[PDB]
Scaffold this active site. Structure first.
Site, mmCIF file in Angstrom:
data_model
loop_
_atom_site.group_PDB
_atom_site.id
_atom_site.type_symbol
_atom_site.label_atom_id
_atom_site.label_comp_id
_atom_site.label_asym_id
_atom_site.label_seq_id
_atom_site.Cartn_x
_atom_site.Cartn_y
_atom_site.Cartn_z
ATOM 1 N N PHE A 176 44.716 52.395 22.201
ATOM 2 C CA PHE A 176 45.450 51.333 22.875
ATOM 3 C C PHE A 176 44.960 51.230 24.324
ATOM 4 O O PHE A 176 44.543 52.231 24.919
ATOM 5 C CB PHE A 176 46.944 51.657 22.821
ATOM 6 C CG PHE A 176 47.549 51.630 21.425
ATOM 7 C CD1 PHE A 176 47.613 52.800 20.641
ATOM 8 C CD2 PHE A 176 48.069 50.429 20.894
ATOM 9 C CE1 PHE A 176 48.195 52.772 19.356
ATOM 10 C CE2 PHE A 176 48.647 50.391 19.609
ATOM 11 C CZ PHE A 176 48.711 51.566 18.836
ATOM 12 N N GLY A 177 44.989 50.002 24.880
ATOM 13 C CA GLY A 177 44.730 49.748 26.287
ATOM 14 C C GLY A 177 43.237 49.673 26.624
ATOM 15 O O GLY A 177 42.391 50.243 25.929
ATOM 16 N N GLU A 178 42.940 48.977 27.731
ATOM 17 C CA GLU A 178 41.611 48.505 28.109
ATOM 18 C C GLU A 178 41.222 49.177 29.431
ATOM 19 O O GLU A 178 42.080 49.257 30.317
ATOM 20 C CB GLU A 178 41.762 46.987 28.123
ATOM 21 C CG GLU A 178 40.438 46.244 28.218
ATOM 22 C CD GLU A 178 40.446 44.802 27.741
ATOM 23 O OE1 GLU A 178 40.692 44.610 26.513
ATOM 24 O OE2 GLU A 178 40.204 43.894 28.582
ATOM 25 N N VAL A 179 39.953 49.638 29.561
ATOM 26 C CA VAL A 179 39.481 50.545 30.614
ATOM 27 C C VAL A 179 38.605 49.738 31.586
ATOM 28 O O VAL A 179 37.739 48.992 31.124
ATOM 29 C CB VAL A 179 38.754 51.811 30.111
ATOM 30 C CG1 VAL A 179 38.365 52.756 31.255
ATOM 31 C CG2 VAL A 179 39.643 52.547 29.110
ATOM 32 N N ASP A 234 42.592 64.771 18.760
ATOM 33 C CA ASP A 234 41.559 63.723 18.677
ATOM 34 C C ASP A 234 40.335 64.067 19.556
ATOM 35 O O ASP A 234 39.784 63.196 20.221
ATOM 36 C CB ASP A 234 42.160 62.327 18.915
ATOM 37 C CG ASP A 234 41.344 61.089 18.517
ATOM 38 O OD1 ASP A 234 40.409 61.213 17.693
ATOM 39 O OD2 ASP A 234 41.619 59.990 19.069
ATOM 40 N N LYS A 273 43.105 52.282 33.322
ATOM 41 C CA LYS A 273 43.386 51.933 31.925
ATOM 42 C C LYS A 273 44.681 51.120 31.877
ATOM 43 O O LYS A 273 45.687 51.597 32.395
ATOM 44 C CB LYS A 273 43.457 53.129 30.964
ATOM 45 C CG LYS A 273 43.475 52.765 29.479
ATOM 46 C CD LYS A 273 43.029 53.849 28.513
ATOM 47 C CE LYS A 273 43.758 55.132 28.677
ATOM 48 N NZ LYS A 273 43.656 55.966 27.482
ATOM 49 N N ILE A 291 35.065 48.425 31.194
ATOM 50 C CA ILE A 291 34.417 49.607 30.610
ATOM 51 C C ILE A 291 34.503 49.494 29.086
ATOM 52 O O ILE A 291 33.465 49.592 28.441
ATOM 53 C CB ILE A 291 35.022 50.950 31.100
ATOM 54 C CG1 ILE A 291 35.001 51.115 32.637
ATOM 55 C CG2 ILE A 291 34.409 52.176 30.391
ATOM 56 C CD1 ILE A 291 33.625 51.174 33.261
ATOM 57 N N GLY A 292 35.734 49.387 28.541
ATOM 58 C CA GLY A 292 36.011 49.115 27.131
ATOM 59 C C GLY A 292 37.408 49.546 26.678
ATOM 60 O O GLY A 292 38.213 49.964 27.492
ATOM 61 N N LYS A 293 37.669 49.441 25.363
ATOM 62 C CA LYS A 293 38.970 49.705 24.754
ATOM 63 C C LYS A 293 39.155 51.216 24.585
ATOM 64 O O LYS A 293 38.177 51.910 24.313
ATOM 65 C CB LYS A 293 39.117 49.076 23.359
ATOM 66 C CG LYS A 293 38.768 47.607 23.143
ATOM 67 C CD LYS A 293 39.752 46.537 23.611
ATOM 68 C CE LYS A 293 39.389 45.184 23.030
ATOM 69 N NZ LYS A 293 40.071 44.071 23.694
HETATM 70 C C1 LIG Z 1 44.374 58.337 31.769
HETATM 71 C C2 LIG Z 1 43.174 57.461 31.975
HETATM 72 C C3 LIG Z 1 43.060 56.608 33.092
HETATM 73 C C4 LIG Z 1 41.931 55.792 33.206
HETATM 74 C C5 LIG Z 1 40.950 55.831 32.215
HETATM 75 C C6 LIG Z 1 41.129 56.709 31.134
HETATM 76 C C7 LIG Z 1 40.118 56.727 30.073
HETATM 77 N N1 LIG Z 1 40.474 56.651 28.745
HETATM 78 C C8 LIG Z 1 39.339 56.625 27.986
HETATM 79 C C9 LIG Z 1 39.135 56.561 26.479
HETATM 80 C C10 LIG Z 1 38.238 57.713 26.028
HETATM 81 C C11 LIG Z 1 38.441 55.251 26.101
HETATM 82 C C12 LIG Z 1 40.480 56.636 25.753
HETATM 83 N N2 LIG Z 1 38.269 56.634 28.795
HETATM 84 C C13 LIG Z 1 38.750 56.666 30.094
HETATM 85 C C14 LIG Z 1 37.798 56.729 31.206
HETATM 86 C C15 LIG Z 1 38.046 57.553 32.318
HETATM 87 C C16 LIG Z 1 37.132 57.632 33.377
HETATM 88 C C17 LIG Z 1 35.987 56.871 33.303
HETATM 89 C C18 LIG Z 1 35.741 56.045 32.213
HETATM 90 C C19 LIG Z 1 36.604 55.961 31.158
HETATM 91 O O1 LIG Z 1 34.558 55.368 32.387
HETATM 92 C C20 LIG Z 1 33.940 56.053 33.469
HETATM 93 O O2 LIG Z 1 34.941 56.779 34.196
HETATM 94 N N3 LIG Z 1 42.213 57.510 31.015
#
Ligand code: A1IAZ
Length: 303
Positions: free
Chosen positions: A19-22, A136, A35, A14-16
């Protein structure tokens, strides 16, 4: 063994984060967001898991936390956070991809306000919720669900308040968030950071900037604006604290409210919320609850 991360198969990057990669993952048939942080990113991982495991946090407009876990691939330990998947992704991506209806705008706006009002409100009790400020809030950190309501993600920078002792759970730094969405008090160093209401007031400002981004995409009879970020006209694409301080503090510009928003009634309510969210004195700004109440009037009204 472990019942979460062992059983999840990663499918798409999905992307960064900060910190940490999605990742898009399959858990037990269901789609999940994963993540993933390195062993050296453990403070960020732990703190974010700590905020999502707050008692009574679960709202329909907060991102649904499944689990924190570890996963040893054989060489190295990965620190996992697992959540609900939403196929649309961020409010940023949605507003770039699509216009919205009049009804569409308020669904996005109400849910974001309901999310932040839930996050901000202390619930006293034995199973008692602390009051939580985001630090944020932005269109990239809010996700859009398949029903077309929003939910707030990226709670890893958040601060939590005990009203009995009058203390914050961490000693907070100056200037943690996205520089573009930083409130004037945050930009000019002037925010008092043993006052908890100031952090809430800093969130309402940024929700104002989010509300502008949504209202640009409201297609009434042909006419919509393009997708822009707040201060597209006035700063560069990765703007400094110095650059943002000169616009917001010194010049005293909001995002520009266009002429045709005066025609429709729903846009004037939103425009009034926006200009009541911008205010260099934070104490002047509205509550998320007063915003939630006002948009919930407009929802239960116009025919
Ligand atoms: C606690 C948690 C667990 C898993 C993912 C995310 C998370 N952190 C972020 C950002 C905004 C980049 C910091 N996005 C997600 C995210 C969560 C759900 C998603 C998704 C991204 O794409 C489609 O469904 N946070």
């Amino acid at each position: 063994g472990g019942t979460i991360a062992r059983t999840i198969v990663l499918q798409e990057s999905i992307g960064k984060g900060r910190f940490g990669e999605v990742w898009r993952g399959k858990w037990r048939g269901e789609e999940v967001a994963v993540k993933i942080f390195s062993s050296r990113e453990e403070r960020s991982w732990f703190r974010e898991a700590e905020i999502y495991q707050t008692v009574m946090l679960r709202h329909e407009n907060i991102l649904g936390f499944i689990a924190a876990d570890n996963k040893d691939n054989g060489t190295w330990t990965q620190l996992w956070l697992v959540s609900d998947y939403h196929e649309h992704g961020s409010l940023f991506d949605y507003l770039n991809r699509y216009t919205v209806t009049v009804e569409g705008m308020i669904k996005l706006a109400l849910s974001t306000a309901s999310g932040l009002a839930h996050l901000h409100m202390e619930i006293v009790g034995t199973q008692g919720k602390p009051a939580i400020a985001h630090r944020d809030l932005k269109s990239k950190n809010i996700l859009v669900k398949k029903n077309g309501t929003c939910c707030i993600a990226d709670l890893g920078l958040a601060v939590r308040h005990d009203s009995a002792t009058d203390t914050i759970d961490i000693a907070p730094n100056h200037r943690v968030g996205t520089k573009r969405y930083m409130a004037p008090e945050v930009l000019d160093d002037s925010i008092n950071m043993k006052h908890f209401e100031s952090f809430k007031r800093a969130d309402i400002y940024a929700m104002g900037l989010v509300f502008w981004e949504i209202a640009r995409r409201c297609s009434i009879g042909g006419i919509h604006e393009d997708y822009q970020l707040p201060y597209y006209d006035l700063v560069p694409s990765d703007p400094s604290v110095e650059e943002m301080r000169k616009v917001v503090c010194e010049q005293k510009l909001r995002p520009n409210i266009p002429n045709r928003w005066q025609s429709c009634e729903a846009l004037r309510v939103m425009a009034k919320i926006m200009r009541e969210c911008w205010y260099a004195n934070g104490a002047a700004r509205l509550t998320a609850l007063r915003i939630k109440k006002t948009l919930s009037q407009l929802s239960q009204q116009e025919g």
